Ligand binder design. Structure first.
Ligand SMILES: CCCCCCCCCCCCCCCC(=O)O[C@H](CCCCCCCCCCC)CC(=O)N[C@H]1[C@@H](OP(=O)(O)O)O[C@H](CO[C@@H]2O[C@H](CO)[C@@H](OP(=O)(O)O)[C@H](OC(=O)C[C@@H](CCCCCCCCCCC)OC(=O)CCCCCCCCCCCCC)[C@H]2NC(=O)C[C@@H](CCCCCCCCCCC)OC(=O)CCCCCCCCCCC)[C@@H](O)[C@@H]1OC(=O)C[C@H](O)CCCCCCCCCCC
Ligand SMILES: O=C(O)[C@H]1C[C@@H](O)[C@@H](O)[C@@H]([C@H](O)CO)O1
Lengths: 58, 58
Protein backbone atom coordinates (compact mmCIF):
# COMPACT_ATOMS: atom_id res chain seq x y z
CA UNK A 1 0.00 0.00 0.00
CA UNK A 2 1.27 3.44 -1.02
CA UNK A 3 -1.45 5.40 0.75
CA UNK A 4 -0.78 8.27 3.13
CA UNK A 5 -1.31 7.60 6.83
CA UNK A 6 -1.40 10.26 9.57
CA UNK A 7 0.71 9.78 12.67
CA UNK A 8 -1.16 11.60 15.45
CA UNK A 9 -4.76 10.83 14.45
CA UNK A 10 -6.91 8.23 16.22
CA UNK A 11 -6.66 5.65 13.39
CA UNK A 12 -10.38 5.78 12.66
CA UNK A 13 -11.66 3.62 9.79
CA UNK A 14 -11.50 5.52 6.51
CA UNK A 15 -11.86 3.10 3.57
CA UNK A 16 -14.03 0.16 2.54
CA UNK A 17 -11.86 -2.50 4.15
CA UNK A 18 -11.32 -0.71 7.46
CA UNK A 19 -12.58 -2.43 10.60
CA UNK A 20 -14.34 -0.84 13.58
CA UNK A 21 -15.27 -2.10 17.04
CA UNK A 22 -18.87 -1.75 18.21
CA UNK A 23 -19.92 -1.99 21.86
CA UNK A 24 -23.64 -2.75 21.84
CA UNK A 25 -24.58 -1.64 25.38
CA UNK A 26 -28.19 -1.33 24.24
CA UNK A 27 -30.86 -0.79 26.88
CA UNK A 28 -34.45 0.25 26.12
CA UNK A 29 -37.39 0.25 28.51
CA UNK A 30 -40.90 1.61 27.95
CA UNK A 31 -43.95 1.40 30.20
CA UNK A 32 -47.58 2.49 29.92
CA UNK A 33 -50.46 2.40 32.39
CA UNK A 34 -54.02 3.67 32.56
CA UNK A 35 -57.00 3.27 34.87
CA UNK A 36 -60.54 4.58 35.26
CA UNK A 37 -63.37 4.08 37.72
CA UNK A 38 -66.89 5.35 38.37
CA UNK A 39 -69.12 4.45 41.32
CA UNK A 40 -72.64 5.69 42.04
CA UNK A 41 -74.71 4.53 45.00
CA UNK A 42 -78.11 5.73 46.17
CA UNK A 43 -80.63 4.41 48.65
CA UNK A 44 -83.80 6.17 49.80
CA UNK A 45 -86.40 5.24 52.41
CA UNK A 46 -89.58 6.62 53.96
CA UNK A 47 -92.11 5.09 56.35
CA UNK A 48 -94.64 6.10 59.00
CA UNK A 49 -95.21 3.00 61.14
CA UNK A 50 -97.81 5.22 62.83
CA UNK A 51 -100.28 7.51 61.05
CA UNK A 52 -102.43 10.21 62.68
CA UNK A 53 -106.18 9.82 62.37
CA UNK A 54 -106.35 13.06 60.38
CA UNK A 55 -103.55 11.92 58.04
CA UNK A 56 -104.84 8.37 57.50
CA UNK A 57 -106.34 9.52 54.20
CA UNK A 58 -102.99 10.11 52.51
CA UNK B 1 -106.06 13.17 71.51
CA UNK B 2 -108.20 10.58 73.31
CA UNK B 3 -107.31 7.87 70.81
CA UNK B 4 -104.14 7.62 68.72
CA UNK B 5 -105.64 10.25 66.40
CA UNK B 6 -102.70 12.57 67.05
CA UNK B 7 -100.15 9.79 67.64
CA UNK B 8 -97.59 10.22 64.87
CA UNK B 9 -94.39 8.49 63.81
CA UNK B 10 -92.42 8.89 60.60
CA UNK B 11 -88.92 8.34 59.24
CA UNK B 12 -87.16 9.18 55.99
CA UNK B 13 -83.72 8.84 54.47
CA UNK B 14 -81.96 9.71 51.23
CA UNK B 15 -78.27 8.89 50.72
CA UNK B 16 -76.30 9.35 47.50
CA UNK B 17 -72.60 8.82 46.81
CA UNK B 18 -70.87 9.18 43.44
CA UNK B 19 -67.20 8.76 42.59
CA UNK B 20 -64.97 8.95 39.54
CA UNK B 21 -61.32 8.72 38.66
CA UNK B 22 -58.81 8.28 35.88
CA UNK B 23 -55.06 7.81 35.48
CA UNK B 24 -52.62 7.69 32.58
CA UNK B 25 -48.85 7.28 32.81
CA UNK B 26 -46.08 6.35 30.40
CA UNK B 27 -42.29 6.10 30.52
CA UNK B 28 -39.49 5.61 28.00
CA UNK B 29 -35.80 5.22 28.87
CA UNK B 30 -33.95 4.49 25.63
CA UNK B 31 -31.32 6.03 23.38
CA UNK B 32 -31.64 6.06 19.59
CA UNK B 33 -29.44 7.63 16.92
CA UNK B 34 -31.49 9.34 14.20
CA UNK B 35 -30.70 10.91 10.83
CA UNK B 36 -31.74 14.31 9.50
CA UNK B 37 -34.57 14.14 6.97
CA UNK B 38 -34.61 17.77 5.80
CA UNK B 39 -33.64 21.29 6.87
CA UNK B 40 -36.52 23.68 7.51
CA UNK B 41 -36.61 27.37 6.64
CA UNK B 42 -35.78 28.45 10.20
CA UNK B 43 -32.93 25.93 10.48
CA UNK B 44 -34.85 23.28 12.41
CA UNK B 45 -33.94 19.72 11.44
CA UNK B 46 -36.50 17.01 10.73
CA UNK B 47 -34.97 13.86 12.23
CA UNK B 48 -36.13 10.30 11.52
CA UNK B 49 -34.45 7.16 12.84
CA UNK B 50 -35.10 3.45 13.19
CA UNK B 51 -33.45 0.53 14.96
CA UNK B 52 -34.29 -3.17 14.63
CA UNK B 53 -33.15 -5.77 17.17
CA UNK B 54 -33.63 -9.53 16.80
CA UNK B 55 -32.80 -11.05 20.20
CA UNK B 56 -34.37 -14.39 19.34
CA UNK B 57 -37.79 -15.57 18.11
CA UNK B 58 -39.00 -12.17 16.96
C1 LIG C 1 -90.92 20.67 41.27
C2 LIG C 1 -92.24 21.10 41.89
C3 LIG C 1 -93.32 21.16 40.83
C4 LIG C 1 -94.68 21.13 41.48
C5 LIG C 1 -95.15 19.70 41.68
C6 LIG C 1 -96.62 19.71 42.09
C7 LIG C 1 -96.94 18.51 43.00
C8 LIG C 1 -96.55 17.18 42.30
C9 LIG C 1 -97.48 16.05 42.78
C10 LIG C 1 -97.09 15.62 44.21
C11 LIG C 1 -98.25 14.83 44.86
C12 LIG C 1 -98.32 13.41 44.27
C13 LIG C 1 -99.72 13.11 43.66
C14 LIG C 1 -100.31 11.84 44.33
C15 LIG C 1 -101.78 11.65 43.89
C16 LIG C 1 -101.89 11.55 42.34
O1 LIG C 1 -102.75 12.13 41.77
O2 LIG C 1 -100.97 10.75 41.61
C17 LIG C 1 -101.18 9.36 41.76
C18 LIG C 1 -100.05 8.60 41.09
C19 LIG C 1 -98.70 9.20 41.55
C20 LIG C 1 -98.17 10.15 40.49
C21 LIG C 1 -97.29 11.21 41.14
C22 LIG C 1 -96.07 11.43 40.27
C23 LIG C 1 -95.60 12.88 40.36
C24 LIG C 1 -94.38 13.03 39.44
C25 LIG C 1 -93.31 13.92 40.09
C26 LIG C 1 -93.62 15.39 39.78
C27 LIG C 1 -92.82 16.25 40.73
C28 LIG C 1 -92.75 17.68 40.20
C29 LIG C 1 -102.51 8.96 41.13
C30 LIG C 1 -103.57 8.74 42.30
O3 LIG C 1 -104.42 9.55 42.49
N1 LIG C 1 -103.47 7.51 43.15
C31 LIG C 1 -104.47 7.29 44.28
C32 LIG C 1 -105.32 6.12 43.99
O4 LIG C 1 -104.54 4.96 43.99
P1 LIG C 1 -104.99 3.72 43.02
O5 LIG C 1 -104.46 3.80 41.67
O6 LIG C 1 -104.58 2.41 43.51
O7 LIG C 1 -106.43 3.61 42.84
O8 LIG C 1 -106.32 6.04 45.02
C33 LIG C 1 -105.79 5.76 46.29
C34 LIG C 1 -106.94 5.84 47.32
O9 LIG C 1 -107.41 7.18 47.40
C35 LIG C 1 -107.46 7.69 48.71
O10 LIG C 1 -108.48 7.04 49.41
C36 LIG C 1 -108.59 7.47 50.78
C37 LIG C 1 -109.62 6.65 51.49
O11 LIG C 1 -109.47 5.50 51.27
C38 LIG C 1 -108.99 8.95 50.79
O12 LIG C 1 -109.04 9.41 52.10
P2 LIG C 1 -110.51 9.62 52.82
O13 LIG C 1 -110.61 10.84 53.61
O14 LIG C 1 -111.63 9.70 51.89
O15 LIG C 1 -110.88 8.56 53.75
C39 LIG C 1 -107.94 9.76 50.03
O16 LIG C 1 -108.40 11.10 49.90
C40 LIG C 1 -107.67 12.06 50.70
O17 LIG C 1 -106.50 12.08 50.68
C41 LIG C 1 -108.45 13.08 51.58
C42 LIG C 1 -107.73 14.45 51.51
C43 LIG C 1 -106.60 14.52 52.54
C44 LIG C 1 -106.57 15.92 53.19
C45 LIG C 1 -105.56 15.93 54.36
C46 LIG C 1 -104.69 17.21 54.31
C47 LIG C 1 -103.49 17.01 53.36
C48 LIG C 1 -102.91 18.39 52.97
C49 LIG C 1 -101.52 18.20 52.34
C50 LIG C 1 -100.96 19.56 51.91
C51 LIG C 1 -99.80 19.34 50.93
C52 LIG C 1 -98.74 20.44 51.14
C53 LIG C 1 -97.90 20.59 49.87
O18 LIG C 1 -107.22 14.58 50.23
C54 LIG C 1 -106.57 15.80 49.95
O19 LIG C 1 -107.19 16.81 49.95
C55 LIG C 1 -105.08 15.80 49.63
C56 LIG C 1 -104.48 17.16 49.94
C57 LIG C 1 -104.51 18.06 48.71
C58 LIG C 1 -103.42 19.10 48.85
C59 LIG C 1 -103.46 20.05 47.66
C60 LIG C 1 -102.20 20.91 47.65
C61 LIG C 1 -102.57 22.36 47.92
C62 LIG C 1 -101.32 23.22 47.84
C63 LIG C 1 -100.74 23.42 49.24
C64 LIG C 1 -99.42 24.19 49.13
C65 LIG C 1 -98.76 24.29 50.52
C66 LIG C 1 -97.98 25.60 50.61
C67 LIG C 1 -97.07 25.58 51.84
C68 LIG C 1 -107.70 9.20 48.66
N2 LIG C 1 -106.49 9.85 48.08
C69 LIG C 1 -106.44 10.17 46.61
O20 LIG C 1 -107.36 9.90 45.92
C70 LIG C 1 -105.17 10.84 45.99
C71 LIG C 1 -105.24 12.39 46.00
C72 LIG C 1 -106.67 12.91 45.83
C73 LIG C 1 -106.64 14.24 45.03
C74 LIG C 1 -107.86 15.12 45.42
C75 LIG C 1 -107.43 16.19 46.47
C76 LIG C 1 -107.20 17.55 45.79
C77 LIG C 1 -105.94 17.50 44.88
C78 LIG C 1 -105.68 18.90 44.32
C79 LIG C 1 -104.56 19.52 43.48
C80 LIG C 1 -103.29 18.69 43.56
C81 LIG C 1 -102.45 18.98 42.33
C82 LIG C 1 -101.00 18.56 42.58
O21 LIG C 1 -104.72 12.86 47.21
C83 LIG C 1 -103.37 13.33 47.12
O22 LIG C 1 -102.49 12.70 47.61
C84 LIG C 1 -103.04 14.67 46.39
C85 LIG C 1 -101.74 15.31 46.98
C86 LIG C 1 -101.50 16.69 46.28
C87 LIG C 1 -100.26 17.39 46.87
C88 LIG C 1 -99.76 18.41 45.84
C89 LIG C 1 -98.96 19.53 46.51
C90 LIG C 1 -98.85 20.68 45.53
C91 LIG C 1 -97.78 21.66 45.98
C92 LIG C 1 -97.73 22.81 44.98
C93 LIG C 1 -96.31 23.03 44.50
C94 LIG C 1 -96.34 23.89 43.23
C95 LIG C 1 -104.69 6.75 46.70
O23 LIG C 1 -103.97 6.20 47.76
C96 LIG C 1 -103.71 7.06 45.55
O24 LIG C 1 -102.99 8.22 45.85
C97 LIG C 1 -101.85 8.04 46.65
O25 LIG C 1 -101.59 6.98 47.09
C98 LIG C 1 -100.96 9.24 46.94
C99 LIG C 1 -100.54 9.21 48.41
O26 LIG C 1 -101.66 8.96 49.21
C100 LIG C 1 -99.92 10.55 48.79
C101 LIG C 1 -98.40 10.47 48.64
C102 LIG C 1 -97.84 11.90 48.59
C103 LIG C 1 -96.30 11.85 48.73
C104 LIG C 1 -95.68 13.01 47.96
C105 LIG C 1 -95.40 12.59 46.51
C106 LIG C 1 -93.92 12.23 46.38
C107 LIG C 1 -93.64 11.68 44.99
C108 LIG C 1 -92.18 11.97 44.61
C109 LIG C 1 -91.68 10.94 43.61
C110 LIG C 1 -92.06 11.36 42.20
O1 LIG D 1 -117.57 10.54 68.32
C1 LIG D 1 -117.33 9.85 67.29
O2 LIG D 1 -117.58 10.31 66.15
C2 LIG D 1 -116.72 8.46 67.44
C3 LIG D 1 -115.85 8.04 68.61
C4 LIG D 1 -114.98 6.87 68.17
O3 LIG D 1 -115.59 5.67 68.54
C5 LIG D 1 -114.80 6.91 66.65
O4 LIG D 1 -113.97 5.86 66.26
C6 LIG D 1 -116.16 6.79 65.94
C7 LIG D 1 -116.50 5.32 65.68
O5 LIG D 1 -116.13 4.99 64.37
C8 LIG D 1 -118.00 5.11 65.85
O6 LIG D 1 -118.34 3.82 65.44
O7 LIG D 1 -117.18 7.35 66.71
Amino acid sequence: NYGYQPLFEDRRPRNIGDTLTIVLQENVSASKSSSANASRDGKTSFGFDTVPRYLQGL
Amino acid sequence: FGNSRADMEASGGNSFNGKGGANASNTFSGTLTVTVDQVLANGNLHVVGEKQIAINQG
